[PDB]
Ligand binder design. Structure first.
Ligand SMILES: Nc1c[nH]c(=O)[nH]c1=O
Ligand SMILES: Nc1c[nH]c(=O)[nH]c1=O
Ligand SMILES: [Zn+2]
Ligand SMILES: [Zn+2]
Ligand SMILES: [Zn+2]
Ligand SMILES: [Zn+2]
Lengths: 364, 364
């Protein structure tokens, strides 16, 4: 039936860029049906200072006063444990995001996941302040020599050893394997969460995107719009992701990884920018998956409950207690999301119709 | 500098699309070091009539008088055995290309490979006229059904059972698995030619493109200029294709599948036209692979000998007795290949350096 009450929705993986790109995307978080959003720091330059993350959050609140913003740091060589403690006590960050060097957009200044020992003092400081270590799990491509070949199709599976070693050396740290794309990564998350029927005892979780529940490799093969990192893998991998989405287990919640790019950055014959834009219809995208799986009863937990529980979002931080109501009204997705200016976006599943819509109903 | 006499080179897979594109790419066949070229019929509309294939060859000979052309028919429901016999008796065609519906460029008016029985009257007529059945070995992608899901990475391996049935039903018909990409296809070709000596005995062979000896999945991921059908697969597959190329076996000869597209057709955000342009440096591309393998003694067979032996190219049909001579002269690939008016093509490995160049020397 229609009009499902979702409460305070969560999108723990968001890119609202900057500039006129920010003026267009930040309001769409509200229009997409999301109240709490976790902002990613891969900007130019990456957000690695206290003044940058504070003024960046202020600019975001001016553009969307009703949206709760959870800020983050870019795991870079410039980060010090002193900066981690100072920013965490001032409530400026909720975690630090890690980018492997060169695997995705604005990841050039990232880290090498084969020598994580350099950032162990950083993770030690994060564990004390109860921050979250967001991981873009993918090994950089290696075609060189005798070592096993690492390519875009198995770079996620080759990273799982690094995830299990980080969970071993920092057991109390909250780690998130962002935007899982392979079945091998799903089984590892279930193995780490072996015997936790305790919703609050989940320390290593995994976010799932909207496009990775639809796309396979065939969808982005000749279509750069569906190209993102990690790449959309085989249908067997999509089968494991969709089952893990409607799973209802507390270690799986929603992170969109909505990466807006100008359409000129996607119509390239080489060097196409990675990332799918799904912010304008974030909740209706996930609504179609849970409807086709006949598991709409687990939609609130995946979108709202498990995200708030893991990040420990207390009610004193929510900028607007308005609730997101998902009512079954057909709407067609526009061919292009534009701002009446040089900026234009091709949204995910542009042209198709979604069975659900989203509106806002405040609490009384 | 070092020189290599290659004789009458062969490129048994060439796309020479109509229009101003034809007048631009057809001379590049001779400039690429290719003397004999097998022309593919995937035009718009495809080449299914006797009048259209006669006029097309005369257009090609008008643009490249010194290049020998071997024409082909497009496997379609419009074909009849009476048309097969008449065309083969006039030396109008040399074989028929099979395009599975919805697999590659201009495949739409194609066939369904898990139902090949409807074209057995055509194969029966081709078997009597000693024609060659060129196969695009890729089952159409099916992600649903109670059967194994088919995608761009296993569509070639899923076609192998169809190739084994055609070689069984028509044992004396010549069949070529065009542009092998997977290792499973390499092992399938070697096993069909188990008890095969004295190359004349080869009935089922395979062509290996120039770009598949360089590219993997990481090369076309985010680079539509390297996107082609079949998809460049994992490094394990690339290793087998290179081993099979320099092996010197008679059932592996060179077919480039040079698929020229305007740069405005590769720079799309949806529906990117597949195909790599490797015509302008066809032979120098292959020479780079054989130099890296120290198997230059087997180069003359892979590009000249095994192609003539399989297609039975008599000396009375060769349009020019000039020999393609490789000489070790370093050259840079241009950034674009343009006719100067409306068409600009991004060539394969544009910007890199090749250690060989091609010149033509008269015979005797
Ligand atoms: N464009 C992007 C793609 N993928 C990411 O993970 N982040 C981005 O910003
Ligand atoms: N563009 C093409 C790609 N692959 C083919 O086999 N033919 C084409 O024309
Ligand atoms: Zn990412
Ligand atoms: Zn992201
Ligand atoms: Zn093909
Ligand atoms: Zn072709």
């Amino acid at each position: 039936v229609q009009e499902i009450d979702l409460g305070l929705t969560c999108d723990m993986h968001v890119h609202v860029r900057e500039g006129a790109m920010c003026e267009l995307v930040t309001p769409k978080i509200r229009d997409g049906g999301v109240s709490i959003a976790y902002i990613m720091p891969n900007l130019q330059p990456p957000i690695t200072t206290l003044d940058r993350v504070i003024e960046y959050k202020k600019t975001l609140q001016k553009l969307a006063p009703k949206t709760t913003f959870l800020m983050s740091f870019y795991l870079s060589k410039d980060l010090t444990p002193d900066l981690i403690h100072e920013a965490a006590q001032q409530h400026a960050i909720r975690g630090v995001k890690c980018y492997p060097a060169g695997v995705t957009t604005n990841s050039a200044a990232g880290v090498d996941p084969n020598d994580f020992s350099a950032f162990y003092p950083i993770f030690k400081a994060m564990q004390e302040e109860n921050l979250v270590l967001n991981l873009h799990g993918e090994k950089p491509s290696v075609h060189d020599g005798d070592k096993e070949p690492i390519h875009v199709l198995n770079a996620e599976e080759a990273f799982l050893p690094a995830l299990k070693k980080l969970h071993n050396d920092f057991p109390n740290l909250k780690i998130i394997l962002e935007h899982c794309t392979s079945e091998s990564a799903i089984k590892t998350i279930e193995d780490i969460n072996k015997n936790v029927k305790k919703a609050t005892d989940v320390k290593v979780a995994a976010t799932l995107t909207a496009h990775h529940l639809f796309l396979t490799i065939d969808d982005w093969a000749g279509n750069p719009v569906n190209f993102c990192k990690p790449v959309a893998k085989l249908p067997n991998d999509k089968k494991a992701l969709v089952k893990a989405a409607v799973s209802g287990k507390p270690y799986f919640f929603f992170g969109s990884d909505s990466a807006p790019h100008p359409v000129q950055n996607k119509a390239n014959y080489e060097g196409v920018c990675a990332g799918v834009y799904s912010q304008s219809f974030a909740i209706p995208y996930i609504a179609q998956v849970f409807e086709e799986q006949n598991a709409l009863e687990n939609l609130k937990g995946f979108v709202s409950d498990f995200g708030i529980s893991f990040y420990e979002v207390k009610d004193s931080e929510v900028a607007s207690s308005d609730k997101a109501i998902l009512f079954k009204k057909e709407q067609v997705i526009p061919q292009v999301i534009s701002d009446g200016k040089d900026i234009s976006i091709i949204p995910f599943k542009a042209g198709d119709k979604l069975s659900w819509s989203v509106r806002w109903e405040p609490r009384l």
